Design a protein around this ligand. Structure first.
Ligand SMILES: Nc1nc2c(ncn2[C@@H]2O[C@H](COP(=O)(O)OP(=O)(O)NP(=O)(O)O)[C@@H](O)[C@H]2O)c(=O)[nH]1
Ligand SMILES: [Mg+2]
Length: 164
């Protein structure tokens, strides 16, 4: 069985870095902005039974927003990513969550992920503030993570998988 997941969120928050870290163990300090949504795969075991993630890594720039439904229409899950160092990205994440609730399948499982936890002092979003959004929106899970340090990336995907 397979998990069809879409990555959404403001450009620069680290959608491609998370999905490449998870699927390929690849991180780039100079990851290029995504033009057309990229497809990425990986198989992971659940509690014995095998599982294939099929991930659509969307371009986050607002000019590519109208393309996002092509990638979210058949999705089982969405990871809506923000950057813990940039307060504005959390409000962008809230807009995506609302858009998904209005336009996507009501069974869609949404996980909120605050990325770049490794950037210490530059944090602008508290754990408390990110989770307040996830609780207010009754999302499936809330994690802070670091694609760069590979911290909590595996755990976000495993958690999401168990909720599908
Ligand atoms: N310090 C730090 N930098 C990160 C982390 N994840 C991503 N980055 C950096 O942030 C920049 C943008 O990352 P990227 O994955 O391209 O973001 P995106 O959300 O895919 N952008 P777009 O929507 O335009 O494709 C890159 O320079 C990348 O190295 C992280 O966990 N920590
Ligand atoms: Mg990208």
């Amino acid at each position: 069985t397979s998990a069809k997941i879409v990555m959404l969120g403001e450009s620069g928050a680290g959608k491609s870095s998370i999905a490449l870290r998870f699927t390929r163990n690849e991180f780039l300090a100079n990851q290029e902005t995504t033009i057309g949504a990229a497809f990425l795969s990986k198989t992971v075991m659940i509690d014995g039974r095998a599982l294939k993630y099929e991930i659509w890594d969307t371009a986050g720039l607002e000019r590519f927003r109208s393309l996002a439904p092509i990638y979210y229409r058949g999705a089982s899950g969405a990871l809506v990513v923000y950057d813990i160092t940039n307060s504005e990205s959390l409000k962008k994440a809230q807009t995506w969550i609302k858009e998904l609730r209005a336009n996507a399948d009501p069974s869609l499982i949404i996980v909120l992920v605050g990325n770049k936890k490794d950037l210490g002092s530059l944090r602008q979003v508290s754990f408390e503030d990110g989770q307040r959004l996830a609780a207010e929106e009754q999302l499936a899970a809330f994690y802070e993570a670091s694609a760069k340090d590979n911290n909590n990336v595996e755990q976000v995907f495993l958690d999401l998988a168990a909720k599908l």
